[PDB]
Design a protein around this ligand. Sequence first.
Ligand SMILES: NC(=O)C1=CN([C@@H]2O[C@H](COP(=O)(O)OP(=O)(O)OC[C@H]3O[C@@H](n4cnc5c(N)ncnc54)[C@H](O)[C@@H]3O)[C@@H](O)[C@H]2O)C=CC1
Ligand SMILES: NC(=O)C1=CN([C@@H]2O[C@H](COP(=O)(O)OP(=O)(O)OC[C@H]3O[C@@H](n4cnc5c(N)ncnc54)[C@H](O)[C@@H]3O)[C@@H](O)[C@H]2O)C=CC1
Ligand SMILES: NC(=O)C1=CN([C@@H]2O[C@H](COP(=O)(O)OP(=O)(O)OC[C@H]3O[C@@H](n4cnc5c(N)ncnc54)[C@H](O)[C@@H]3O)[C@@H](O)[C@H]2O)C=CC1
Ligand SMILES: NC(=O)C1=CN([C@@H]2O[C@H](COP(=O)(O)OP(=O)(O)OC[C@H]3O[C@@H](n4cnc5c(N)ncnc54)[C@H](O)[C@@H]3O)[C@@H](O)[C@H]2O)C=CC1
Ligand SMILES: CNCCNC(=O)CN(CC(=O)N(C)N1Cc2ccccc2C1)c1cc(Cl)ccc1Oc1ccc(Cl)cc1
Ligand SMILES: CNCCNC(=O)CN(CC(=O)N(C)N1Cc2ccccc2C1)c1cc(Cl)ccc1Oc1ccc(Cl)cc1
Ligand SMILES: CNCCNC(=O)CN(CC(=O)N(C)N1Cc2ccccc2C1)c1cc(Cl)ccc1Oc1ccc(Cl)cc1
Ligand SMILES: CNCCNC(=O)CN(CC(=O)N(C)N1Cc2ccccc2C1)c1cc(Cl)ccc1Oc1ccc(Cl)cc1
Lengths: 429, 429, 429, 429
Amino acid sequence: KLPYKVADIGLAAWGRKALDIAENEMPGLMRMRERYSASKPLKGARIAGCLHMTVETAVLIETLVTLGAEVQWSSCNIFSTQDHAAAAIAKAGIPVYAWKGETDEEYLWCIEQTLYFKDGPLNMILDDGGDLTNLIHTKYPQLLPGIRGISEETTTGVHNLYKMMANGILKVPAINVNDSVTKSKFDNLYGCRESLIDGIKRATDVMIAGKVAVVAGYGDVGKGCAQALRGFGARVIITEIDPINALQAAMEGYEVTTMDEACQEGNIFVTTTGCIDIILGRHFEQMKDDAIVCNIGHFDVEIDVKWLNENAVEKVNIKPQVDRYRLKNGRRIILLAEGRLVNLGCAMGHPSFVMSNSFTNQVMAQIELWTHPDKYPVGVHFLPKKLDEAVAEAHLGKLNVKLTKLTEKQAQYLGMSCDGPFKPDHYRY
Amino acid sequence: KLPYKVADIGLAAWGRKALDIAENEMPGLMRMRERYSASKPLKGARIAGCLHMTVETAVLIETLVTLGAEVQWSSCNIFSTQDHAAAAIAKAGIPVYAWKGETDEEYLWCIEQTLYFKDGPLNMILDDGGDLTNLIHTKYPQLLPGIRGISEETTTGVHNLYKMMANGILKVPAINVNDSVTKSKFDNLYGCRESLIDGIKRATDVMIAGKVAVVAGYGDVGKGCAQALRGFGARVIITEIDPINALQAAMEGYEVTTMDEACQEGNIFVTTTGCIDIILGRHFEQMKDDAIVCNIGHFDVEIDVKWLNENAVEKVNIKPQVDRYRLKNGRRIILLAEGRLVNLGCAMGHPSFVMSNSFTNQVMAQIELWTHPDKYPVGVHFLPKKLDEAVAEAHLGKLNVKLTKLTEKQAQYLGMSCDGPFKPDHYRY
Amino acid sequence: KLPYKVADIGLAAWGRKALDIAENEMPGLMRMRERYSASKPLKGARIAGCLHMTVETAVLIETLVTLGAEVQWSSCNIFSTQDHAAAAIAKAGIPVYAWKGETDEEYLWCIEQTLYFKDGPLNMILDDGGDLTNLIHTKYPQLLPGIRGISEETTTGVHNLYKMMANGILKVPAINVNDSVTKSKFDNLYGCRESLIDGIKRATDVMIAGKVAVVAGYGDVGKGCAQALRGFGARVIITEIDPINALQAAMEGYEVTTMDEACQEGNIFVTTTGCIDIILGRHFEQMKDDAIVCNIGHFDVEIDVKWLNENAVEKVNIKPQVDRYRLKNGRRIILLAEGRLVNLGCAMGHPSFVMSNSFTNQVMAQIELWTHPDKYPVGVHFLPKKLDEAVAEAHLGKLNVKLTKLTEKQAQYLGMSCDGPFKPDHYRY
Amino acid sequence: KLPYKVADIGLAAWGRKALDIAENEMPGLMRMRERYSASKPLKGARIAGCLHMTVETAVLIETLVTLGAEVQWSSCNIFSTQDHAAAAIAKAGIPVYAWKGETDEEYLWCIEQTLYFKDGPLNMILDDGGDLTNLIHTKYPQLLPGIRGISEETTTGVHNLYKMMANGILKVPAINVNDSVTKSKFDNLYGCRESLIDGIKRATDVMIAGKVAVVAGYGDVGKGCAQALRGFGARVIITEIDPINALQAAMEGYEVTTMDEACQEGNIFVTTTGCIDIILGRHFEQMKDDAIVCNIGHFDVEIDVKWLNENAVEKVNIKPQVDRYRLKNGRRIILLAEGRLVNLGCAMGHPSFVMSNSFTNQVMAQIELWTHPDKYPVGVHFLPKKLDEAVAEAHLGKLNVKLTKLTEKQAQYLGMSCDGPFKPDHYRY
Ligand SMILES: NC(=O)C1=CN([C@@H]2O[C@H](COP(=O)(O)OP(=O)(O)OC[C@H]3O[C@@H](n4cnc5c(N)ncnc54)[C@H](O)[C@@H]3O)[C@@H](O)[C@H]2O)C=CC1
Ligand SMILES: NC(=O)C1=CN([C@@H]2O[C@H](COP(=O)(O)OP(=O)(O)OC[C@H]3O[C@@H](n4cnc5c(N)ncnc54)[C@H](O)[C@@H]3O)[C@@H](O)[C@H]2O)C=CC1
Ligand SMILES: NC(=O)C1=CN([C@@H]2O[C@H](COP(=O)(O)OP(=O)(O)OC[C@H]3O[C@@H](n4cnc5c(N)ncnc54)[C@H](O)[C@@H]3O)[C@@H](O)[C@H]2O)C=CC1
Ligand SMILES: NC(=O)C1=CN([C@@H]2O[C@H](COP(=O)(O)OP(=O)(O)OC[C@H]3O[C@@H](n4cnc5c(N)ncnc54)[C@H](O)[C@@H]3O)[C@@H](O)[C@H]2O)C=CC1
Ligand SMILES: CNCCNC(=O)CN(CC(=O)N(C)N1Cc2ccccc2C1)c1cc(Cl)ccc1Oc1ccc(Cl)cc1
Ligand SMILES: CNCCNC(=O)CN(CC(=O)N(C)N1Cc2ccccc2C1)c1cc(Cl)ccc1Oc1ccc(Cl)cc1
Ligand SMILES: CNCCNC(=O)CN(CC(=O)N(C)N1Cc2ccccc2C1)c1cc(Cl)ccc1Oc1ccc(Cl)cc1
Ligand SMILES: CNCCNC(=O)CN(CC(=O)N(C)N1Cc2ccccc2C1)c1cc(Cl)ccc1Oc1ccc(Cl)cc1
């Protein structure tokens, strides 16, 4: 068996430098190390993880080991791996099987390499997407009884765990950190607020101010995109199907209309609905010349890119992930990342600090399941709020934020603990 | 039995004028009238309501009557009644017992005058605070079996219902709208965002820009206040005990520190915590000369006003609800609304539009319990999300927002009905 | 001759309290006292001032006396006088002739009472509007040769001084502080940014967020109004005739269209053009029901109020300075301050801090002319930039702003003085 | 004589593609072409231009040719040339001598190749920096009499012209567009507001929100930077030596303190002062670990980069224009663009729209001097306001802004022409 398997393990030094720079932007993970490198709460844990092997992820991996756990890793996407990051981890003596440009077979193979450790099979699952979880349940059920828990941080993964639980397939308790506030806020709102303009600029260097940016959807992703754009002097127009979300947009002074109407006025189009058929041929045919069109929501189903390919009389590539289509009416459309996520194809994805919040959630989930099995029956569970609060608290230091502490008299008055949780479950923040 | 009892019935024309103006700012309620006047969904209902007899409440009252319900009213606070509003309601032929400046005996007496209608006792309760709910359960248990449902819009009322239900005292199904998105956002965040500065201005007419505003708490009230203040050019400093809220404030660029520290720097102080002992004497002794101190949170437990009264060298009234205290150190503290709600004592409370969201929620709850009893066993129930969205949709027309409608293909793709609910119960917005 | 002449000199105590509260918001004037109560740079000066006798103005008056000058005063408007402020000044032993509600004759008479002092005629003119300056040049030219200077802070006054100089009528050097940055920025942008929403709220208490506010003009007044409104969640629409100003608005994300178009969409209308015929009958006839219309620009020539009076089928007064007209089409228009300045009729005018900037400019001008006659030939002169900077610097303390100081090496490098001026004359800020 | 000299003429197609895209972002220039191609206002003109041979400049060049002028070009910086842009210009048949990576001898040689045209010497100078202007006056005085005019858009160029004129060296009428509103606002404020964060992101991809950004200087660059940063959720701290600018920052709610103080708190540092010694070693020794330090002001005199090179324990290159220094205290400083302009070394410079305003100003100046020589005696002249407004109007169409036109009654009332100028020379905007 291979001790690891990466593109080029000689990229380790480069990777190490990147990690040392990333560590400063990932205080939540570092705070965990500072608090648990001694008590080692993950001692005895054999964590098989399936998550984009990136620099940020590497910091997550080394955080787990510092907490006393045995860790074997694989990416959860065949292109997400940053080889110098994978090398660094491999070089550190941690079994990592990942590299940019894997084939479906290799991808599957990589996840299988992480199943058995030096002294036995995994006993913990840290997933992102559910692949690792499905592989075990479908192909290696013999290992389920030996697995103490599963932590999942994606919508897909959680949706999948629910179907499994609904079908009596799930055999391991799973903690969903996708819906924790610290995870969702950063992964959806803040993360995208930081990268949208970044992806659009690197792709076109266009001036934002003075332009009409139509943002389909006003959820967390949409909210952050709208906020970012507004911050640059763009007149943001929102489209929405949810009356509640629409009202929120209206209360911020954003015009809320339909795509069918806005397509005639927007200079920049951003989709964040997570729904199909947002921008279509009839919308394209109405757009102003050189209207920039991009998606930051769901994979590539929001924009009808196929229509552009089948109807444009021209298709000129300006630069990677930036294409300029000319339409039969003579107007050109500038499509980014080929209809895929603009912040991935035209930028570097989420900032490290954002990833720190998501991963510090994975760590919390891992510690919670590993040390409190007795508390979790097979099924999908939300991350305890006190743990979600612990994540945010772990990031306050870096922000040099002085958190106030309730006096015993105040806690009694409020009917809560000095250490929380400070909010009821239904609280929306 | 008096057909009603109001200060001076001759204020009806004035009240009627105020309501007419208010209606245009309360589309949610007007939408209900346009959509239900013909079908009379509240036909047969004998609704007893205990809610501040204001102009806004008046519009809610008449909306209930338009929907076919019989109505008898009383204010839920001895000072909250706007006589002209009550006068208009009384002249319209609706039994209303409320006037500004009631006594405790009169207050109780007013609620009692609403329990019995011309042709029988009430069968529906619309409450704000749980007074009416308690009065009946404790003093009129005999009337409980003929009451179909209860709707409550306040935190106190809801908590109360919970204790009741917990102890087996609750005998009528109740719907909590206090926690609905449309109600909470407008009642907490948007509402205060519109009035905070309005109150401070009327009280002092001071220049906001350039001042350091310390806002204790970053919940919805804090968020709304910090936003309002920042919009005016004031540097906002946040204090918080919850790491999640503190992190959110930090993400918006607000310095988050402790009051013990900010008290030496703030020009304006605003408490929105809902907790006691926020601004104490040790903070006062540190404040800059003429610091403006106000509470827009919990009644009067946030600011230690008692300390001021017992430690200041002077307590000079500047104008109603505005007091300038002089301390031993020679500096003066400008206290607003005597440490009570600044937007109530120094302003006109929540804008009509805000109240519309709260009250339209009430109408929804009333219609739900009256038409679908079968769906509500005795207990505290959250307003179904589909109705919360309907409250929001009802306000989109005035804002002239054009909501998008999912196509069957999109709805099927999204796994939701074209008419909602569009979000899961845990969605935080 | 009367030693003074005010409405009720028994309002002095009340006035004194107001001044003591205002003093904290007028650091620039107080800084002058702290720096010149000893050297008394105005010693020998007999300043006749014609400026709205308000609390803020009172602080200006007492600042001049502290600087060693003899001062006699009159308002520059028959309604601007705040009697308790006038009393305080009278009670202090300073000849003040003003009171709210003067007649044209009394108004004229009041200015004449300030011309001769205990030991001779005035020798300095501190004007606001030019009346005092015209009275002397037209009716008392015999006094011109004995007058050493004139300071003017209004557009009208300065425009007038230019005509006088163009016609060889001006006989005294005049310093124009209307165009100083500290004066203009506060008097136009900041001042109106602070009061617009204040005037609109006190008049209607309407919710700003979610509304479309059309702001005619994007100069300093327009800029501040737009900024204020945007800060509340209103979708601001701008109208402009200047391509440069319009472009600025577009760069901030504001839609810029014509009134002819916006009148169909605005909920709130604010005029700041300083031009006639902004909102007309054809605009009114297109407005949404209860559209709020107000002017914060020029006196009362921007809105065609006369049309409303001559064409409305109804005119209902909601409260002072707030009228609701009903049009033949059935829609109602809510007009504020009868077409006049909304921040004057529905609010308390400019905040004290704003007035502090304008007046600290008058003081600077007064000191400059009185002590440096040799530097000013008859004619209109701009306030030296170093003096304009001195005004801003005088307000930094209150703001607890730590201004950096150029090192000798930096000054030489920049080719400027450690003490300024720091900017060339054409610099726009 | 070479018809031109560019890196690789085979990059023309690429350059042509970039220009086509750029044109849509440079309406000002395209407006000139549409409005003047037929009348050829620059007919007979032999224009020699020395301006960064960029894609944006290319559009300016072709605009000049469309207006009937002959053109020969050279870059005004040995590194600013974008070869593909120069290739397109060369292929279009325009003599252009520029390529990235020139030497000092080549640079000089390139400007010389533009002085003589096929049928005679130049008669018009379009300069950016004053190089071309100096070269001719000092090395080619014989060509001076046949040169009708000069247009300069940089501060250095303008100051230079002033010294020249002062010393009697200037022999050709020159128009300064550096101080026009459209040029200055876009070149200083808007330009940097669009690129600052873009540069910081490409260099570090760091999370802006939650960070403390210290911006030294609050001029237009500082204003734009502070705005951009604040829009991203960063708490902005301002340092200033000018009390007026400092007061403006305070009015927008920015804490204004000294670098000596803020150096201990900033996560990001941005210098925009145009002054030397802003960030010194004593500041560095105080900064938080991994503080990002960058200059977007004056070339490289603002940050003491020499101190870093001589005092750091390490100087590790992270990527081009991004260096991580490690200090004796063990902390690291992330320096961008080696202390030079961050938006140039870590971004793509000013957006095309911004450059359009600068270059459209150039066209205006060229047309003015060529068609109205009689109006310009030898000397430095400001671009007439009416033309500055025309530059702005030329960009309103793309923004799809609908400017309002004064009626004769309004114009007569305002005392101005329906076509402007709409503002006096001292108006600051
Ligand atoms: N690019 C990135 O880095 C990230 C992408 N995402 C993805 O973005 C998508 C949305 O994410 P969130 O904002 O968190 O979800 P959300 O549920 O908060 O927001 C989606 C919003 O789009 C609206 N919407 C749906 N169909 C619409 C339509 N047809 N027209 C107009 N509006 C419509 C919904 O009412 C909803 O409010 C998801 O697919 C999510 O997985 C999430 C985080 C980051
Ligand atoms: N004035 C008005 O018109 C309104 C007043 N309220 C009242 O305002 C209060 C708070 O309401 P929301 O903002 O909705 O609640 P919330 O729970 O959203 O906000 C309260 C926040 O204060 C923070 N906090 C508590 N103790 C603190 C302390 N000692 N120091 C610093 N921060 C502290 C908490 O972490 C919490 O995030 C309640 O009492 C509520 O009933 C609510 C709506 C309107
Ligand atoms: N209410 C108050 O407390 C104050 C009132 N003002 C008054 O407000 C007015 C304007 O003041 P500023 O903003 O300082 O002047 P400004 O000259 O900076 O602004 C006027 C703007 O209105 C635009 N404009 C003119 N006619 C227009 C039209 N017909 N349609 C659309 N836009 C048009 C102009 O292009 C100009 O940019 C003046 O009359 C001034 O005296 C000034 C300060 C305070
Ligand atoms: N990076 C780019 O793309 C651009 C760079 N610039 C350059 O940026 C610099 C400044 O330009 P602007 O903002 O237009 O000038 P400005 O004069 O408007 O701003 C400079 C400001 O820095 C302040 N300042 C000077 N020394 C200071 C010190 N020692 N400490 C704190 N503050 C100090 C001044 O009071 C002044 O307000 C110039 O060198 C200019 O040429 C201009 C446009 C674009
Ligand atoms: C270099 N820093 C990389 C940080 N990113 C990661 O570690 C893993 N991430 C997360 C991420 O950055 N984003 C933007 N996600 C959040 C999300 C939620 C829901 C649906 C889609 C997405 C996309 C991630 C996710 C996906 Cl689908 C694909 C690649 C990913 O990693 C990289 C790797 C290299 C680069 Cl140059 C950029 C990104
Ligand atoms: C004149 N417009 C009146 C609109 N207001 C109403 O109808 C009833 N309201 C609601 C309200 O305006 N606010 C600000 N609430 C929301 C809230 C939630 C939780 C705790 C405290 C509060 C205070 C309300 C509530 C309370 Cl406790 C006391 C009085 C009230 O009415 C008035 C009546 C007259 C005037 Cl001049 C102003 C207000
Ligand atoms: C109570 N604080 C009063 C502060 N105000 C003053 O001292 C004198 N001011 C200045 C002022 O507040 N504004 C808003 N100006 C600026 C301006 C510039 C150009 C054209 C019109 C205006 C109106 C002023 C000007 C005019 Cl025209 C009429 C009255 C004035 O005083 C008062 C007096 C009482 C009250 Cl309750 C409010 C205001
Ligand atoms: C690719 N887009 C290029 C647009 N830029 C240009 O055309 C010429 N510009 C202007 C510019 O973009 N900026 C940011 N200036 C404005 C300014 C004013 C005062 C002092 C310094 C500066 C820097 C410009 C100026 C200078 Cl000093 C050096 C290079 C320049 O061009 C490029 C060329 C290639 C690239 Cl990849 C980026 C920029």
